[PDB]
Amino acid sequence: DPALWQCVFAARYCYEE
Amino acid sequence: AFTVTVPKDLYVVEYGSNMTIECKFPVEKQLDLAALIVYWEMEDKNIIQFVHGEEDLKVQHSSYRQRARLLKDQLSLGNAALQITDVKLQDAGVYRCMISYGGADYKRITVKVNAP
Ligand SMILES: *CC(=O)Nc1ccc(NC(=O)C*)cc1
């Protein structure tokens, strides 16, 4: 679950920056 | 088991004000900061990534940079409190705190933004 959340937080960071 | 609570589930705030939205989580005695993970998200924007006792601001969505931060000193009380200063119309939407502290849980909060 924190794994999944960090998976998504990192995926969006790639998209934004 | 591990439950995260929200005092209210809907916040209506005026444009240009500061808002503080809160999530509560269970803390037995002191606080194991190694154990604590906090994530705040709204819509598709990364607001706050706090994990294993450390902040991460590079992941934060650019619209919240220096405008949004997690209020730490309440965490030792079991409160993950996201404050956003100078609320914009685009701060309206659905927010979600995600807390891991041994167990893990999350809640959703809706924000409505006025204008005057
Ligand atoms: C599970 C997971 O963390 N996946 C993941 C993390 C980060 C990225 N980052 C980029 O692509 C830059 C991809 C996938």
Numbering used by the authors:
A (entry chain B): 1 to 17
B (entry chain A): 18 to 133
What does the paper say about this structure?
To target disease-causing proteins that are inaccessible to small-molecule or antibody therapies, we are exploring the use of a nature-inspired drug modality that exploits the intrinsically favorable properties of synthetically constrained α-helical polypeptides (Helicons). Here, we report a rapid, high-throughput screening platform utilizing phage display that enables an unbiased mapping of the α-helical interactome of a given protein without any prior knowledge of its structure or known binding partners. Analysis of 14 high-resolution crystal structures of Helicon–protein complexes across six different protein domains reveals a range of binding modes, all of which are “side-on”, i.e., mediated exclusively by Helicon side-chains rather than involving main chain amide interactions. Biochemical and structural experiments demonstrate diverse functional impacts by the Helicons which bind these sites, including inhibition of protein–protein interactions, inhibition of enzymatic activity, induced conformational rearrangement, and induced dimerization.
We selected the ECD of the transmembrane protein PD-L1, which binds to the ECD of Programmed cell death protein 1 (PD-1) to suppress T cell function, and which has not, to our knowledge, been shown to bind α-helices. A screen for PD-L1 binders afforded two clusters of Helicons (C61 and C62) that were both predicted to compete with PD-1 on the basis of their on-phage competition behavior. The asymmetric unit of the FP28132 / PD-L1 cocrystal structure contains a symmetric dimer of two FP28132 / PD-L1 complexes. We have also structurally characterized two other Helicons, FP28135 and FP28136 derived from the same PD-L1-binding phage cluster, and observed a similar assembly. This revealed an extensive series of contacts between both the two Helicon protomers and the two PD-L1 protomers. Taken together, these findings demonstrate the ability to discover multiple α-helix binding sites to a relatively small ECD that was not previously known to have any, as well as the ability of Helicons to induce protein dimerization.
